[PDB]
């Protein structure tokens, strides 16, 4: 909801919980295949869904 996108809790929570999967997927899509994306892919999937 737009009326929940405030200045204190939204800005605090969204990025924190959002950075989880990008970091995890990056831990093998970088040292196994030097894949530059992987956070972009996570975010593209999240946004599409």
């Amino acid at each position: 909801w737009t009326d929940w996108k405030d200045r204190r809790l939204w800005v605090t929570v969204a990025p924190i919980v959002s950075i989880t999967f990008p970091a995890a997927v990056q831990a093998v899509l970088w040292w196994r295949y030097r894949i530059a994306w992987g956070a972009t892919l996570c975010v593209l999937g999240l946004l599409l869904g």
Binding site: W1, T2, D3, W4, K5, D6, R7, R8, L9, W10, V11, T12, V13, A14, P15, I16, S18, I19, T20, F21, A23, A24, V25, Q26, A27, V28, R32
Partner: protein, 95 residues
Amino acid sequence: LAWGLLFYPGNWPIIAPLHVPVEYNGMMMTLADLQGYHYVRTGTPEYIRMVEKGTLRTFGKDVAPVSAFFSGFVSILIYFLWHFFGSWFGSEKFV
């Protein structure tokens, strides 16, 4: 730090139009509050809304930046932890 700090700036151009103030039946409300008021969410009463409400230890306008720096600092640790978590998920061990 970047992840934490780029969020609100990256979203502001999208939600700014909905922060124009409005006087509705004598009370002042933003267009976003007016939306939340008009379109009934029978399952989401207003009081569950976890948004900034002001305190005696809060300053007049300092929420957005302070919450983006705190979020960046915590994102540091979150990325740290989930790097190792993901390294584990990449394991090829057999049991």
